[PDB]
Amino acid sequence: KTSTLIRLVQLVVSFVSLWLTAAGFLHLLENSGDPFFDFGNAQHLTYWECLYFLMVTMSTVGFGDIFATTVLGRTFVVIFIMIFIGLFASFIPEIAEILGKRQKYGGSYKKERGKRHVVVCGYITFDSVSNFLKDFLHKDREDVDVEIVFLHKGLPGLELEGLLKRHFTQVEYFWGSVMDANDLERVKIQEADACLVLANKYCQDPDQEDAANIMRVISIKNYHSDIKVIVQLLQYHNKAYLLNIPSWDWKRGDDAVCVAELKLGFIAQSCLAPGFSTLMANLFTMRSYKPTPEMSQWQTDYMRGTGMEMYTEYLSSAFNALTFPEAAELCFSKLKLLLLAIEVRQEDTRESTLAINPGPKVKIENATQGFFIAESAEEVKRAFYYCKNCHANVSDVRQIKKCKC
Amino acid sequence: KTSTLIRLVQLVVSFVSLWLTAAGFLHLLENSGDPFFDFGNAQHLTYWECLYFLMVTMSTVGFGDIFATTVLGRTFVVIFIMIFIGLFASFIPEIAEILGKRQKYGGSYKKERGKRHVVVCGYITFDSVSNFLKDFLHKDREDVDVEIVFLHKGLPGLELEGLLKRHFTQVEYFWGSVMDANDLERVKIQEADACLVLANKYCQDPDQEDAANIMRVISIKNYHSDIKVIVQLLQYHNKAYLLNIPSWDWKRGDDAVCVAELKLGFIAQSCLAPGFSTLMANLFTMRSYKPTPEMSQWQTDYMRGTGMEMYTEYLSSAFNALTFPEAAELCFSKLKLLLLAIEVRQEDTRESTLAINPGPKVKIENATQGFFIAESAEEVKRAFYYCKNCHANVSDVRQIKKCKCPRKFDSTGMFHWCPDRPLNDCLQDRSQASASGLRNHVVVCLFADAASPLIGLRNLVMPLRASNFHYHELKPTIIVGNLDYLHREWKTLQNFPKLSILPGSPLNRANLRAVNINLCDMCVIVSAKDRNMEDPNLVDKEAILCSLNIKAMTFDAGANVPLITELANDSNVQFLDQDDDDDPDTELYMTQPFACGTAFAVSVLDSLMSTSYFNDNALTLIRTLITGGATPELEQILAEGAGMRGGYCSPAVLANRDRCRVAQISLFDGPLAQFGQGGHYGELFVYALRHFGILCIGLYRFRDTNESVRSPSSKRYVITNPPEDFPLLPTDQVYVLTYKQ
Ligand SMILES: [Ba+2]
Numbered sequence A: 001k002t003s004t005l006i007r008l009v010q011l012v013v014s015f016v017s018l019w020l021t022a023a024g025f026l027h028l029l030e031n032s033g034d035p036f037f038d039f040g041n042a043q044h045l046t047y048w049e050c051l052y053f054l055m056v057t058m059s060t061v062g063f064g065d066i067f068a069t070t071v072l073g074r075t076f077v078v079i080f081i082m083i084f085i086g087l088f089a090s091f092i093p094e095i096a097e098i099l100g101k102r103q104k105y106g107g108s109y110k111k112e113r114g115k116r117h118v119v120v121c122g123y124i125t126f127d128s129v130s131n132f133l134k135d136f137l138h139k140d141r142e143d144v145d146v147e148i149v150f151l152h153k154g155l156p157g158l159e160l161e162g163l164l165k166r167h168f169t170q171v172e173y174f175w176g177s178v179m180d181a182n183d184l185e186r187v188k189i190q191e192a193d194a195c196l197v198l199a200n201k202y203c204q205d206p207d208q209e210d211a212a213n214i215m216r217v218i219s220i221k222n223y224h225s226d227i228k229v230i231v232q233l234l235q236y237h238n239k240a241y242l243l244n245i246p247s248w249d250w251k252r253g254d255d256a257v258c259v260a261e262l263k264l265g266f267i268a269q270s271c272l273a274p275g276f277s278t279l280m281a282n283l284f285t286m287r288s289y290k291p292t293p294e295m296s297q298w299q300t301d302y303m304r305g306t307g308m309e310m311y312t313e314y315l316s317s318a319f320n321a322l323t324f325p326e327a328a329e330l331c332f333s334k335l336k337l338l339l340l341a342i343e344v345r346q347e348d349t350r351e352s353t354l355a356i357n358p359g360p361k362v363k364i365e366n367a368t369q370g371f372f373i374a375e376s377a378e379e380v381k382r383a384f385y386y387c388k389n390c391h392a393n394v395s396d397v398r399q400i401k402k403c404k405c
Numbered sequence B: 001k002t003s004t005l006i007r008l009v010q011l012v013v014s015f016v017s018l019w020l021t022a023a024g025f026l027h028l029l030e031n032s033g034d035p036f037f038d039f040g041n042a043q044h045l046t047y048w049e050c051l052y053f054l055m056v057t058m059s060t061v062g063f064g065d066i067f068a069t070t071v072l073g074r075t076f077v078v079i080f081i082m083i084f085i086g087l088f089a090s091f092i093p094e095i096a097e098i099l100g101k102r103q104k105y106g107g108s109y110k111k112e113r114g115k116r117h118v119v120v121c122g123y124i125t126f127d128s129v130s131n132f133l134k135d136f137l138h139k140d141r142e143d144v145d146v147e148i149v150f151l152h153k154g155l156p157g158l159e160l161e162g163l164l165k166r167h168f169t170q171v172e173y174f175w176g177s178v179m180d181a182n183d184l185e186r187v188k189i190q191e192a193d194a195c196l197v198l199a200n201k202y203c204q205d206p207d208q209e210d211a212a213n214i215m216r217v218i219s220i221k222n223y224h225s226d227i228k229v230i231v232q233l234l235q236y237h238n239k240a241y242l243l244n245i246p247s248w249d250w251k252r253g254d255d256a257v258c259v260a261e262l263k264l265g266f267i268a269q270s271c272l273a274p275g276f277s278t279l280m281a282n283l284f285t286m287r288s289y290k291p292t293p294e295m296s297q298w299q300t301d302y303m304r305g306t307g308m309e310m311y312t313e314y315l316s317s318a319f320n321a322l323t324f325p326e327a328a329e330l331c332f333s334k335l336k337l338l339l340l341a342i343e344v345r346q347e348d349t350r351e352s353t354l355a356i357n358p359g360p361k362v363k364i365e366n367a368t369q370g371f372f373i374a375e376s377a378e379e380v381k382r383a384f385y386y387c388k389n390c391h392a393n394v395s396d397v398r399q400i401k402k403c404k405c406p407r408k409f410d411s412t413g414m415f416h417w418c419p420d421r422p423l424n425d426c427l428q429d430r431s432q433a434s435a436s437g438l439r440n441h442v443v444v445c446l447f448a449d450a451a452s453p454l455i456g457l458r459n460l461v462m463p464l465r466a467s468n469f470h471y472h473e474l475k476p477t478i479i480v481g482n483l484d485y486l487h488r489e490w491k492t493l494q495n496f497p498k499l500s501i502l503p504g505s506p507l508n509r510a511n512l513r514a515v516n517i518n519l520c521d522m523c524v525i526v527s528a529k530d531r532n533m534e535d536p537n538l539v540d541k542e543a544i545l546c547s548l549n550i551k552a553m554t555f556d557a558g559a560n561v562p563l564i565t566e567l568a569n570d571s572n573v574q575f576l577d578q579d580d581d582d583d584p585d586t587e588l589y590m591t592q593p594f595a596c597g598t599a600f601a602v603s604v605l606d607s608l609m610s611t612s613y614f615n616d617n618a619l620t621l622i623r624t625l626i627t628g629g630a631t632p633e634l635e636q637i638l639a640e641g642a643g644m645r646g647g648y649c650s651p652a653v654l655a656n657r658d659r660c661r662v663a664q665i666s667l668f669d670g671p672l673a674q675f676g677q678g679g680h681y682g683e684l685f686v687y688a689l690r691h692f693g694i695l696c697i698g699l700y701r702f703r704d705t706n707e708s709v710r711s712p713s714s715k716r717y718v719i720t721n722p723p724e725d726f727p728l729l730p731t732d733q734v735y736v737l738t739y740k741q
């Protein structure tokens, strides 16, 4: 099924055929004798012994167990030595390049059921992948099994190869491209959870890179039309081209991460309130709180805050029909949680309208989703189990778990 | 005869001479003994045995049958080991590079008598050769033995090597160039049938590539002065340089296949009649009709039409002294053949004037050549054997075999014309474009840079301005694209009336709102940018983005906008439609975009290099069908560098003003509406031909019946010349070769 394989099999077949015919020739001439001496020097030499001796002398070993005693046998031995040496001297380079033509990153991706995987493509490159790998495979995660199946065109770098090897239990790599449906079948996009598309944030033509990324999104949506795709864009005006894709449903999960918009908005919010860039750069990034005696008071106090993240939880039955300020100050004073925002538009027509610190007019409806700032998911789980009576005065929030209705 | 051969023989002679002299030296020293022991250790060792042992130890084998027993013999053995090891360590690299210097594609081309071969040169490259190989070596051909003898400079690619190997019984390859008479002798051009010259359709300087191709043609004509040469050109203005070659005789077979002219003319004819690009892209290309149970009704009905081709045959004695409409409707009703055109000027002075669907005035002379649309050559053979009596009432055509005896026009009068005006005379902004009530017009979304290579928008607007259209029938073409590129194009574009310009990117939705695109009759999407230097799948990013953006708009009919994207890489066609659900490995045709006329690939023009060789009259029929006539005198006029010129032309040259154009008609309403009420295609064909002189080429039919439940889309696919008893849906449209409006 491969031209290189055809070439390799042709070479090996030619080699073995010449080996066999030379063995037969030498066996005949050695067992027959020499007409110069009227065949008086013939020796009883089995053909398989001649095959042994011939391969021994082809490998430039020459044990000497079997050897040509006949004069013409010796002459044929020498002639075959020249022929073999010239044959290799002429045929080694193509064998070497055939061996080097073996791609080390082909093959499909195989996973077992229940093991989610995420396809990552676009601008796979050490600097562009290192931060995403640090956040995605960060150590103190609620590590539901998820494998990052990369799909890039060129060979990975040496440091990128080290990243691949050190996370080999989770991270894989596959030569190919997004715009090949066979390639997307290799990485099993039909049963993938999501498909991230990284971008080159420092390219000379942001519009062309954004167009290429949108083309990759088009390919992904053409292959599988109901897969969540997270796209890294370089310009805000190129964020509307994704709306043209008929399979791009924002409500279904597809999002665009605009580099310019998000970066300059972080900076602008820092302009409004200094240091607000690093507040949200740590709110929405996996960081580890591992205090050490070396770090000072301020440094430990900041490292405690950097390890705190944002989570989503459904407000328990207690918060129902309650105003937002009361609910938030109850989550802080009682449950020791920081309730930022709530999805509120689920009342009339459609969900996904995040009221951030809304006025007292907005009331908590039943089973609304609220966003909390907390150390981990177990702490925010308390917001789902709080009840009017069974947790009315329960201090030591560790005990606010699984009310009995 | 070769310096490398001299070097190799010198090395091998030196090696053998040192081998022999070392053998002699070792033999002498071993058989003499050792003066240290007074020659008491000498052994009877024959010289040939020493030669054996020496070559054994040179190969690093060392059997041990023969060995140096003398002490000085052993010392010489070791010394020769150092000398040999150093000799190889110093001389291996030059041996390796000499072995690598052996060109694997030299040598001449040898063929046996009776086996025609075609030389192909120019831009031999996997993408540029794959389509031409698909058409030329297509499986169900009348495969008269013909070998494609390539002649290119560099090594073929890995995929090109695979193409060479898989067609090795027919396709060969030879290192060299066209501009070497020895090279042209190697590929036996002196006894070649033709010599095609491919071109790089995506080069950064089309003029330089065209000049190089014309130089190759000059070389070929200098070597052999009576060989048919088919040339692939990138610009229409470079098509006149071939007339300067004294050995270039158009009547003798030499033709020029202009990429820009043919591509933009296909697109313009699609503008006049939607989906007409893929009708002729399948009429003049070898396609296989292999219906399978997997394919649906519409897909099989289209695949039956794509397998139908155009052939040339001499009209039998029955058609003599008969008018064209009668002959054509007889070939359809009786012989079940579609007679498009006839060569008619053989009457007075010279042949090769293809009257396409001529009026009843033209009569069929004796032994005239007519062009038919048929499945294969055996079907068109019936047109040569039909007779008045022996086939008067013979049904089952299988048995019809072997009878027993104030408007300013261009000076040529072919195109509408206006006096040269500056660019700002038509340049408009969004306010002016919106103010002008453009309706049923043609929008051209042109993705070009300020320095992107010229593509000749003339060839897009030239067919749009044919003199057979009334001035009020002219579609007002408006171009939305870069402004500097349009400054460069205006020198050629200025002479066409009703043209307009809107600068700025066509991806900008405000432009498309301004130049009403919900109301436009066609929205061409051409990309003039320099591509194919990037990833092949990312080549058409801008065209696909524009198509999706236009299809996603809303007005006060986003998907009802008729647009024809042109694809540089055909594999991108899959991204044009999402409901197609077609496999990625499907060929360019059989895909919903191409089968519906929405997509168009330049690769089709490559296949036109094949048919133009097999059928001499194919290209001149294509140009007459496409470019509004493009009389040779017109490119002689343009060859004078003065540009397109003319005034109020005399009625004598206006006689050709009413020729046969291609258009679409609707069976929903009109004199032909009754045939849409469950009628059959043959009835419509015969009635239209007899009553209006209208030649129904084929059908443009909804992909699924437009009932808003089967398919709520306005998507239509093309069927080229459906059978006699084809049912006619009332919503079907008909491609017609209408004459006199
Ligand atoms: Ba944490």
Ligand SMILES: [Ba+2]
Binding pocket: B140, B287, B288, B289, B307, B308, B309, B375, B376
């Ligand atoms: Ba056929």
Ligand SMILES: [Ba+2]
Binding pocket: A222, B574, B575, B576, B577, B578, B579, B580, B581, B582
């Ligand atoms: Ba598709």
